[PDB]
């Protein structure tokens, strides 16, 4: 059975630098070169970059190149841009009394742009949300790079459940992320505490926003 | 390549 | 040349669904086609292909559970005995002889769940009323309690786009989906309206948000 193995996620590169992703096949690929490369951004279909190991598809920037033959294939991005932040997939076939094909597991490329600290917003639940019996408190960390960690505190106690984070893809112009973090509690739980705190930590910096239930 | 159709233009 | 998937929806575990891939700009007599799926947050997974003569072949895991067939302009994927392991975006691709998959469709989502389609509820996001105002304010909409994905969000009927961030959906412990959208405006701007659409229930919700 044909198995394609890619460089583990994530792989990093500075803007203007170079990154290489490997694709290793468990068996020789057909004609030694029937290996193709795909770019996928979150929420979009894949895009064909390269077929036959090294031929660029129509319209693909020449900063993409492919090399290798047989079992060991490499995708290289030269002069990496923020717009190259994506998951990259190889796909190959071999002929064993019929076509046996597979995809590699995908390699996420994180593009390092200029570091910027987040600005942080917190949103208390609307009255009609509290009235449902389930509260959602929304915190957002805007326009930041590199990655942040988010802590929720409620009157000083670290929350360990009811938290969900959702991060935008890297911005194609400046490599930055945005993040939504939510704390979900019952209305009973929400009404039993005062201070709700979203703490966003980027290495040695934190930005903290709070509100006092009853002051809003 | 029986049944495999046409190559990339 | 284009391909377009259709048929994705909520389907009960054990159920059967048929997806359709509609092509234009090329002959299914001259090009092979493939089905590829992607579970949420997971990699591309090859399902099978169909040759120019209509002979279908399958990934070893399919085990006769799926059937690929075509017409002059369409290719189907009939899937039986569906489980949560089959929840995914399903893509069709034209598969060139020399291995390139191109083009891809937008994908159709199959959600294998016991739940019923459910419209989203929309709640305003505004800063705590006691906060000192500055020259600009960030407002938003929380969209929750919908099934299946997706929803779409626009602001001011698609006329407000600058300073809009709409986050990827999350599945809540309830099994329903949630997302937020925020927009930054001048503090003395007119109220802004989020427009939420949920195709699965043919539901549209507007919510006008103003500084608290
Ligand atoms: Ca896989
Ligand atoms: Cl695969």
Residue numbers in the entry:
A (entry chain B): 1 to 216
B (entry chain C): 6 to 14
C (entry chain A): 1 to 212
What does the paper say about this structure?
To elucidate how functional methylsite-specific antibodies recognize the antigens and lead to the development of a novel method to create such antibodies, we use an immunized library paired with phage display to create rabbit monoclonal antibodies recognizing trimethylated Lys260 of MAP3K2 as a representative substrate. MAP3K2 is methylated by the oncogenic methyltransferase SMYD3, and methylation of Lys260 has been linked to functional regulation of this kinase. By studying the local environment surrounding the methylated lysine residues, we found that the four antibody clones examined recognize the methylated lysine residue by using several aromatic residues in a cooperative manner. The pockets formed with the aromatic residues, termed “aromatic cage,” are also observed in reader proteins working in the recognition of histone modifications and an antimethylated histone antibody, which specifically recognize methylated lysine residues.
On the other hand, the methylated lysine residue was deeply buried in the interface between the heavy and light chains in C9 and in D6, both of which recognized the protein antigen in Western blotting. On the contrary, the band corresponding to MAP3K2 was clearly shown by staining with C9 and D6 in a SMYD3 expression-dependent manner. The corresponding band was significantly diminished by the mutation for both C9 and D6, demonstrating that these antibodies specifically recognize methylated Lys260 residue. Considering that each Fab uses different combinations of aromatic residues, i.e., F9 uses two Tyr and one Trp, C9 uses two Phe and one Tyr, E6 uses three Tyr, and D6 uses three Trp, the combination of aromatic residue is not likely to be a fundamental for the recognition of methylated lysine residue, instead indicating the general importance of the CH–pi interaction between the aromatic residues and methyl groups in the methylated lysine. On the other hand, C9 and D6 each made seven hydrogen bonds with the peptide. The fewer hydrogen bonds observed in C9 and D6 compared with F9 and E6, together with the comparable affinity ranges among the Fabs, also suggests the large contribution that deeply located aromatic cages play in peptide binding. The results show that the binding response of the amidated peptide was nearly abolished for F9 and E6, whereas in contrast C9 and D6 recognized the amidated peptide with comparable affinity with that of the nonamidated peptide. We subsequently evaluated the stability of the aromatic cage formation in C9 andD6, both of which recognized protein antigen, to assess if the cages stably form regardless of the antigen. The results showing large fluctuation of RMSD values in the apo structures indicate that the relative position of aromatic residues to each other continuously changed; i.e., the cage collapsed in the absence of peptide antigen, suggesting that the aromatic cages would stably form only in the presence of the antigen even in the C9 and D6 antibodies.
